Amino acid sequence: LPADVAEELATTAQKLVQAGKGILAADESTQTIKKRFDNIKLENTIENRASYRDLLFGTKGLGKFISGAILFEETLFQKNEAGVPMVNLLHNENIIPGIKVDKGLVNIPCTDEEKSTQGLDGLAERCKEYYKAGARFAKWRTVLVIDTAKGKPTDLSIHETAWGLARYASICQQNRLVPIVEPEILADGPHSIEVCAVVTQKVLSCVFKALQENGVLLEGALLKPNMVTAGYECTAKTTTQDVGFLTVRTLRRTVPPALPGVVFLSGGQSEEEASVNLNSINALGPHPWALTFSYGRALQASVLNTWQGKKENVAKAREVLLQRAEANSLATYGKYKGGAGG
Amino acid sequence: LPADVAEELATTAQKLVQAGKGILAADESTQTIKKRFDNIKLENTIENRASYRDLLFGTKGLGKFISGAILFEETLFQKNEAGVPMVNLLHNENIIPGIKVDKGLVNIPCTDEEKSTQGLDGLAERCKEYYKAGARFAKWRTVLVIDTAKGKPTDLSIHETAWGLARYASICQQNRLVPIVEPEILADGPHSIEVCAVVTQKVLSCVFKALQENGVLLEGALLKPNMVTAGYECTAKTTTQDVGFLTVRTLRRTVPPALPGVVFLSGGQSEEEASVNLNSINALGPHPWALTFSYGRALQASVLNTWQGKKENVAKAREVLLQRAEANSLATYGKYKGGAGG
Amino acid sequence: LPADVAEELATTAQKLVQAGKGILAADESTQTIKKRFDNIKLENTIENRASYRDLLFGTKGLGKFISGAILFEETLFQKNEAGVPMVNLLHNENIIPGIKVDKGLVNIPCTDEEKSTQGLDGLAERCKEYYKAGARFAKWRTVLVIDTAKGKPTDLSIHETAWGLARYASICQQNRLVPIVEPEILADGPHSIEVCAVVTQKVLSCVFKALQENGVLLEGALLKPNMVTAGYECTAKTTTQDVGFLTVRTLRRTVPPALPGVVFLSGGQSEEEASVNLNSINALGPHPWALTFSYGRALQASVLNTWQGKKENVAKAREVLLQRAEANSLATYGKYKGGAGG
Amino acid sequence: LPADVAEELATTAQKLVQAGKGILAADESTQTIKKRFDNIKLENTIENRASYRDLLFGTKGLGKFISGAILFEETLFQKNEAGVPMVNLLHNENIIPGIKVDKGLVNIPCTDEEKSTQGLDGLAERCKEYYKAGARFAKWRTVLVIDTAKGKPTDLSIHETAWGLARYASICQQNRLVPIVEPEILADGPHSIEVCAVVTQKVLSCVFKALQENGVLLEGALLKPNMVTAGYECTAKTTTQDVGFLTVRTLRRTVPPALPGVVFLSGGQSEEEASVNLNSINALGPHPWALTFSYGRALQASVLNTWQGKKENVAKAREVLLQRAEANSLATYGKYKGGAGG
């Protein structure tokens, strides 16, 4: 890898997880964002989306709590109503433009409907396309599922996820883009927080091994794993402390120090849950990597809520955004005392 | 895998390598065919290709020496000058329509220009599109290289190859399409035939393992490997006896009997050489699988040559096709005495 | 591997599974044989064992149904009461002396009591020791267990078994000894004959892959797998035909033609069950390898029974031996009609 | 793994690499020590070794620079001339008793004389035997070699190494014994330091992966790798700065933070060089793990030299020990200024 691009990779990767800042994931596809909009009964118009992405990226002050924003293709190339290109709104607040570059989840034949992530085809060309658009980091999401009964996640699922992410990451780096390796394991099921730690540890082990095999520069890469948590169905009352501990443990057991940081994913956690947990993790003293956030839902839920599509509520909702952005910023320093919303 | 599709895959896989028949590869992309045409100084027009494909698939009597013909997308959906759909010319002569599903070779980042075969994005839908259009089996080509000095093929190559193929092969089988797993090792370089056997043995072992890992029904699939030959620069005069022995050996050492047959590839072998070799192979007593051919160049060279585009030479050319196509048919039984051309 | 030793390996491996002959496993350790003896209330004296091994190996005519006898260390070096060395009794009846060379099963730390096989330490020296004693083939037994609920056999179990056998086999060959690779999967449990086929296929896949990695000459090796059968607890009434089919399928799906033969293991099957099943397997037409037996209990049960330790019953029991030896010999040709005992 | 043993392993692992202390390797086998003694023309008698070990473990004040000392079986159970048990000399100076558990290197069949470390047979029982005798941690040494031309280290080596270590490491941990995973890559050959980094990175990656696969509690174990240096024939004058950088890099790229520390090995480095290098390493700011030493030769050379066996030189020699032992202690803090000998 050219010493220049390499140096670039390392720089942005490190800038992406600088002290007190996380990444806002506003990369919802036209489909998923529809889901988000439906909750506030908003019409999934191109105008509505543009107004939304403009609401987030235009929030004056967002640059202190956000290091980078993961953008969806559309948004990466669009402008708001007043002709201001979205990436410029980011630049205004010193936020780094990012771009989701995977073409979605499909099933693996001969597995009980376990996902595979499309995107490798043409990815290299797209990367350049995006860099020119002003993007500096990319994201590719995979989905693993725990089901002790049905033996999930199977080795094929794990191997597939390992190799895919690896291939993808090796490509982005070639094209001056820092890869956010996202091997998400879904909390779905009655599995306990212990199983989650075990499965999460196994997966990450495989992941990094694949990264090694393909030659992914860890120093110019980021990991976006699921925090260790109980299954959605597990009645056993686990505490935020367990979450933090078990998570930090499994990470220390797998993630080499070369990796600049870990940008956590809220998954199905509530906005507060994510803030607290993230906090309880950093609360656990000095870690060898940054343990920040890459929150989307956990950062947008109330925003999208209080907005209701009605521009009359734009400012009001922009505050809500900073409210959550600051919570998670302090949570970075283990300084978030539950209060910025519930 | 549904008992119905399984049975079908098994059926066509076995039909595709029936006694005495091989596969005709006429799936040349617009670019590659251009190269072929350039030799006879023919213009790479749509009409010219149409006439050429038509010339091949029209050859009355072709069905006795040809089980199936690998078509390129275009040819799979086109007709000849007289409005006759190309697939129909095949049906006429009882030939099975095949389709090349790989979207091309690309480089693996962090390897000395080693390839990665594009395709998996969409492949499922495309497979359906093709099945409807009368495609029964598919093709995917991977390119490995031997370079002892530079340590090629690297594990990354061999790995990417294995997983790529297996990924494709499973998708195809899901969509009633028999997959021809093509792990081609370029005979380029001064490597000896002994090294070719070793490397090939390795490569195959890794491939079949990935096939297993992904759930590729061997009984409903086929393999198109290179024959065990010396390198293009190996001054060591090796015999066709050697080619036959080593090849049969490395195959017995790696291919499970559940695999219907091996459709050999000519590569850079002269039409006669490919025939001779394929004969030397089959000559080695009964084998657990069919050791047939899936030639393209070693079948078309003389035809395209004698044709010169001039329709005035159509039948003259077609004769040459049957000349070769029969040569190899006998080679199948080990009954080919070097004579059908040189 | 020296062409001479290699040639030797191939020869004995092929001689070991010649037409109509199987291998008698009389390699019970002082512990296990105690178990066998207890059933007839025999004292586990050295004299008793010697009388026993002498009863088997002395049976005039045993050389037609037995190609080789797997011996336990002791027996390999002992003589009978009249000073006749055991290996000489074998030579008399043209039976090839074999030797169990693994030091037993221990557990794998961090697995639910899954076995690991000791023996690698010093194995090479022992091999020579044994060859000098007149042994030509060796055996090393591993034990895998199916438990869908507890996810057994785990990958660690499978990987361990794969690598161990591999290491062992590569050593024996070096020392002029043909290795009988035995990856036994126990029928214990409520798993169905379908699961057994699936698990057995997975395991064999891994096994042969490891063999490849270590460089085990398949042509000078033998496999001793468990037949595909229902779990001991599975109430679902399976037929001998299913057993035969499913077994042959999984074998064709994994075992390369290079492997000279497969010497089946009776495990917990009754003497007849083993004869019938073995028969129903060969009944399934021409196979690419020998599918013979390596029966021990299935060959000794009635012998040890009718003998009762009382020499007055030696001849009577010797007949019983041939009775079973012939059953399984015909079963080799798919010619065993249930009758030689029940 | 029991919470009690887990805690213990974790404890001693962390104690074994406490600030400023390293490990003294005096586990030399009767044969290797003979070599050492031959240099000072001393007779390899039982008494001589006893006096030598006694000289080392008696050094009043040694405990400040030495956390633990790797003993050979003999020394672990012997006493000095005055009847004082060797382990007691250690306890006196608060040094932790360690034991080498590997039964020696052997060749891997079908590799150009690459090693395989014996031991696993019995290791469990022996571990108990040793724990009782006061052994708290253990040692196992694997030897890999770099030979770009002959493609060394082969995957078979790297694999066997990884699985061997992990197998041992898990057994030790079961029996309250902290395992020192020793993947030594011989600096032999003209390979550059860049290649050493690459190969080392690879090797470590594979090792930690096997450790994971086997369930080796990283927190209760330690690693003894080679430092990243150039080959014995590499005329390219590399600096200690380079050694320090590359080494720190390849480690950050492969070692999870859960691993307490890295106990470096001198190999063929001169006492001073090992000190300098180890200093250049620690000099590179704070690290997530302890980058201490586990020297043997680089600690004993001058001592054994100045001793000449003549007890008349005992104290004179002991001073030299503390001379070096302190050198490295400061090297630990990056405070060693080249002066304690040359």
DSSP-assigned letters across all residues of A98-129 = EEE----EEEPTTSSS-EEE--TTTHHHHHHH
DSSP assignment of A235-250:
-S---HHHHHHHHHHH
Count of CB pairs separated by less than 8 Å, A with B: 61
Measured CA to CA, the distance from residue B32 to residue B48 in angstroms comes to 14
- Checking DSSP bridges between strand A115-117 and strand A105-107, what pairing results, if any? antiparallel
Q: Are C309 and C54 in contact (CB under 8 A)?
A: no
- Bond preceding residue B153 cis, omega within 30 of 0: yes
Q: Write the residue in B202, B218, B252 that is nearest to C258 by C-beta.
A: B252
Q: A270 labelled as ligand-binding?
A: no
What residues of chain D lie within 8 A of the CB of C110, using their CB? 1, 170, 214-215
| C338 and C276 Cβ atoms separated by less than 8 Å | yes
CB contact under 8 A, D215 and C120: no
Distance separating alpha carbons of residues C175 and D139, to the nearest angstrom: 30
Give all chains having 3 or more CB-to-CB distances under 8 Å with chain C.
A, B, D
CA pair distance A260, D223, nearest whole angstrom: 23
Report yes or no: A258 and A13 within 8 Å, Cβ to Cβ: no
Q: Residue C322: count other Cβ atoms within 10 Å of its Cβ.
A: 19
Count the alpha carbons within 13 Å of B162 in the hemisphere toward its beta carbon: 24
Longest Cα–Cα distance in chain B: 54
Q: Which tokens belong to C219?
A: 């042509």
The conformation of residue C248, written as its DSSP 8-state character, comes to H
Whether B98 contacts B172, CB under 8 Å: no
Name the catalytic one among C28, C73, C160, C182. C182
* D309's tokens: 């066996």
Torsion of CA B73, B74, B77, B79, to 10 degrees: -150
**B107, B214, B217: best to mutate for the A interface, most A CBs within 10 A:** B214
What does the alpha-carbon distance between residue C183 and residue C227 come to, in Å, rounded to a whole number?
A: 11
Residues from chain A that touch C151, judged by Cβ atoms under 8 A, are 148, 151
- Nearest CA among D17, D63, D22, D15 for reference residue D331: D22
Substitution target in C204, C205, C207, C287 with the highest count of B β-carbons within 10 Å is C205
Cβ contact, residue pair A110, B171, below 8 Å: no
Both tokens assigned to C204: 């064999």
Q: Which residue of B has its CA nearest to A157?
A: B214
Q: Which residue has the tokens 């040189």?
A: B342
Handedness of CA D130, D131, D137, D138 (dihedral sign): positive
SS3 A7: helix
Resolution of the solved structure (Å): 3.0
d(CA D5, CA B217): 47
Nearest CA in chain C to B207: C209
Structure tokens at A151: 């033996």
Q: How far is CA B223 from the centre of its chain?
A: 8
Check: CB of residue D193 under 8 Å from CB of residue D243: yes
The Cβ-side half-sphere exposure at C34, using a 13 Å CA radius, reads 5
Catalytic residue among B182, B184, B271, B273: B182
- Nearest by CB to residue C121, choosing from D109, D121, D159, is D121
From chain A, the residues in CB contact with C148 under 8 A are: 151
Which chain B residues are Cβ-neighbours of C256 within 8 angstroms? 252-256
How buried is B149 (Cβ within 10 angstroms: 0-12 exposed, 13-18 middle, 19+ buried)?
exposed
Question: CA-nearest residue of chain C to B217?
Answer: C253
Of A118, A170, A173, the CB nearest to B121: A118
Annotated binding site of B for dihydroxyacetone phosphate: 27, 139, 224, 266-267, 296-297
Extract the runs of DSSP E, i.e. beta strands, from chain D: 22-26, 66-71, 96-100, 105-107, 115-117, 137-145, 178-186, 222-223, 261-264, 290-293
User: Chain C contacts of B257, Cβ < 8 Å?
Assistant: 252, 255, 257, 287-288
Determine the length of chain C: 342
In angstroms, the CA A96 to CA A89 distance is 10
> Which residue, among D228, D178, D220, has the nearest Cα to D203 in the 3D structure?
D228
- H/E segment holding residue B184: strand B178-186
Is C256 close to B258, i.e. CB distance below 8 A? no
Residues of chain C in contact with residue D128, where contact means CB-CB under 8 angstroms, are none
Query: Where does residue C181 fall: left (phi above 0), alpha (psi -120 to 50 degrees), or beta otherwise?
Result: beta
Q: Please list every residue in chain D whose beta carbon sits closer than 8 Å to the beta carbon of residue A291.
A: none
Kindly determine whether residue B252 and residue C257, on different chains, have CB atoms separated by under 8 Å. yes
Spacing of C-alpha D22 from chain mean position: 10
Map tokens 């001592």 to a residue: D303
Q: How far apart are the first and last CA of chain B?
A: 46
User: CA-CA-CA-CA torsion for C303, C307, C311, C315, nearest 10 degrees?
Assistant: -50
In DSSP terms, A222 is beta-bridged to A180
The position carrying tokens 């080796």 is D216
Distance of CA B65 to the CA centre of its chain: 15
Count of structural domains, chain A: 1
CA dist D201 and D161 (Å) reads 14
Identify whether A260 is preceded by a cis peptide bond (ω within 30 of 0): no
List the structure tokens of C158. 């499978």
Identify residues of C whose CB sits under 8 angstroms from chain A CBs.
148, 151, 155
**Known catalytic residue: B93?**
no
Two tokens, residue A248: 């930090």
Other CB atoms within 10 A of residue C150 CB:
14
Task: Give the CA count within 13 Å in the CB-facing half-sphere of B215.
Answer: 19
**Distances from the Cα of D18 to the Cαs of A288, B200, D289, in angstroms?**
19, 51, 11
Nearest CA in chain A to B107: A171
| Contact list, B205 vs chain C (CB under 8 Å) | 209, 212
Packing angle, helices D155-174 and D3-15, rounded to 10 = 110
Flag whether C167 is marked binding. Answer: no
The pair of structure tokens assigned to B219 is: 């009984």
**C-alpha closest to that of A193 among A226, A234, A251:** A234
Q: How far apart are CA B75 and CA B54, in angstroms?
A: 9
Q: If you measure CA to CA, which chain B residue comes closest to A212? A: B156
Strand, helix or coil for residue A320: helix
Across the interface, whether the CB atoms of B156 and A214 are under 8 A apart is answered yes
Q: Taking CB atoms and an 8 Å limit, are A256 and D255 in contact across chains?
A: yes
* Residue of chain D whose Cα is closest to the Cα of A250: D258
| A107: nearest CA partner in chain B | B171
Nearest Cβ partner for D119 among C121, C155, C167: C121
Closest CA to D209 of A213, B101, C132, A55: A213
The tokens for A32 are 């998923």
List the alpha helices (DSSP H) in chain C. 3-16, 32-38, 46-58, 73-77, 86-92, 123-133, 155-174, 193-214, 240-252, 271-282, 297-307, 314-332
Instruction: Name the nearest CA neighbour of D140 among D154, D109, D113, D161.
Output: D161
Show contacts of C126-131: CB within 8 Å, 24+ apart. C126/C101, C127/C101, C127/C171, C127/C172, C127/C174, C127/C175, C127/C176, C127/C177, C128/C175, C130/C76, C130/C99, C130/C101, C130/C177, C131/C175, C131/C176, C131/C177
Q: Please answer yes or no on whether C256 and B254 come within 8 Å at the CB atom.
A: yes
Residue A32 annotated as binding site: yes
Any long-range contacts for A283-288 (C-beta under 8 Å, 24+ apart)? A283/A244, A283/A334, A284/A244, A284/A245, A284/A248, A284/A334, A287/A248, A287/A251, A287/A252, A287/D257, A288/A252, A288/A257, A288/D257, A288/D288
Quick count: other Cβ atoms within 10 Å of Cβ A299? Answer: 30
Q: What is the DSSP letter of B227?
A: P
CA distance B222 to chain C (A): 13
- Put simply, the answer to whether A124 touches B110 (Cβ < 8 Å) is no
Q: How far apart are the first and last CA of chain D?
A: 46
Using an 8 Å CB-CB cutoff, list residues of chain D that contact chain C. Answer: 1, 103, 106, 108-110, 116, 118-122, 124, 155-156, 159-160, 163, 167, 170-171, 173-174, 213-215
CB atoms A155 and C151 under 8 Å = no
**Of residues A28, A224, A271, A273, which has the active-site annotation?**
A224
Please tell me the experimental approach by which this structure was elucidated. X-ray
How far, CA to CA in Å, does C328 sit from each of A100, C34, C182, C273, C320?
64, 26, 20, 11, 13
Q: How far is CA B48 from CA B36, B55, B78, in A?
A: 12, 10, 13
Instruction: Give which of A157, A144, A126, A260 is closest to A196, Cα–Cα.
Output: A144
A155 vs C contacts (CB less than 8 Å): 155
Q: Interior CA angle at A305 toward A301 and A309, to 5°? A: 125
Which residue in this structure is represented by tokens 């849950």?
A273
Quote the longest CA-to-CA distance of chain D.
54
Which H/E stretch holds residue A291? Answer: strand A290-293
Domain that holds residue D210: 1-342
Considering only the beta carbons, identify the residue of C212, C219, C253 that sits closest to B256: C253
CA angle centred on A249, ends A264 and A187, rounded to 5°: 50
- Per the CB < 8 Å rule, is D214 touching C109? yes
| End-to-end Cα, chain C, rounded Å | 46
Q: Which residues contact C149 (CB under 8 A, 6 or more apart)?
A: none
Q: Is B182 a catalytic residue?
A: yes
| Contact assessment for residue A205 and residue A250, using Cβ atoms and an 8 Å cutoff | no
Question: Which CATH number does the domain housing residue D307 bear?
Answer: 3.20.20.70
Rounded to the nearest angstrom, the minimum Cα separation between A213 and chain B is 7
DSSP B72: P
What is the phi/psi pair of residue D319, to 5°? -60, -45
The single residue of D114, D184, D224, D271 carrying the catalytic annotation is D224
Beta carbons within 8 Å of B237's beta carbon, 6+ residues apart: none
Distance from CA of C288 to the nearest CA of B (A): 6
Query: Chain C partners of B258 at a C-beta cutoff of 8 Å?
Result: 249, 252-253
Please check whether residue A114 is in contact with residue A152, taking contact to mean a CB–CB distance below 8 angstroms: yes
Q: Rg of chain B over CA atoms, in angstroms?
A: 19
What angle in degrees, to the nearest 10, is found between the helix axes of A3-16 and A155-174?
110
The tokens for C179 are 């290795």
What gap in Å lies between CA C336 and CA C328, rounded to an integer? Answer: 7
- C73 Cβ contact partners less than 8 Å away, ≥ 6 residues apart: C99, C100
Which one of A182, A219, A271, A273 is the catalytic residue?
Answer: A182
